């Protein structure tokens, strides 16, 4: 009655608590899983990017009516390299600093010209903090030049 | 009395059936954790292979706004290189030993 229902109840309470305590324990182990998981994606990605081969510089020194472009490379020596098709022959002129593949030495990108000996040595860094509203008394002078 | 004992029994029974299955599920997730940890260590070994010499001096000639930095080797080639996030090209400036 009361004895019978309670004796059932007692054993159901004991074993629930057991399973409960291991679920919480392996729950922490799961959060740990998440943490490692992030790290696997991250470490891999960034390593790959530097492994990626970089491209050499050259300067179109002569251009040929055989579809070949003679580019004097930054190695020093001068080479006869063949342009791709991502870079056209009406997109290239002699005097154009250009990009060659490291592993085949073919013109595969353009890098305008001339970018030396320092194009930040020219100075083009940071717009100046003065504006017309921060100048007064040179009203006439502003008008003419502004326009 | 008889009403009360039936109710706490229903709870302890129900909670059990749920919790046993959750435990068993998560038993396997322990193994999954061992798998990821090892793979993190393996990849951290790669990060180090880079860091090692031979290492060569470069000086930044210019920065191009397209995702490459034009860096002149002391051997002689200027080259356009793609950075990672371990170092950035933000750290780099013109005339910078690298």
Curated annotation (Swiss-Prot), chain A:
Q: What exactly does this protein do?
A: ATPase which is responsible for recognizing, binding, unfolding and translocation of substrate proteins into the archaeal 20S proteasome core particle. Is essential for opening the gate of the 20S proteasome via an interaction with its C-terminus, thereby allowing substrate entry and access to the site of proteolysis. Thus, the C-termini of the proteasomal ATPase function like a 'key in a lock' to induce gate opening and therefore regulate proteolysis.
Where in the full protein does the shown chain start and end, and how long is the full protein?
Answer: 9 to 155 of 398
What family classification does the UniProt entry report for this protein? Belongs to the AAA ATPase family.
Name listed for the protein in its UniProt record: Proteasome-activating nucleotidase
In the UniProt record, what gene is named as encoding this protein? pan
Domain comment? Consists of three main regions, an N-terminal coiled-coil domain that may assist in substrate recognition, an interdomain involved in PAN hexamerization, and a C-terminal ATPase domain of the AAA type.
In this entry, which stretches build a coiled coil? 1-52
Subcellular location per UniProt equals: Cytoplasm
Q: How does it assemble?
A: Homohexamer. The hexameric complex has a two-ring architecture resembling a top hat that caps the 20S proteasome core at one or both ends. Upon ATP-binding, the C-terminus of PAN interacts with the alpha-rings of the proteasome core by binding to the intersubunit pockets.
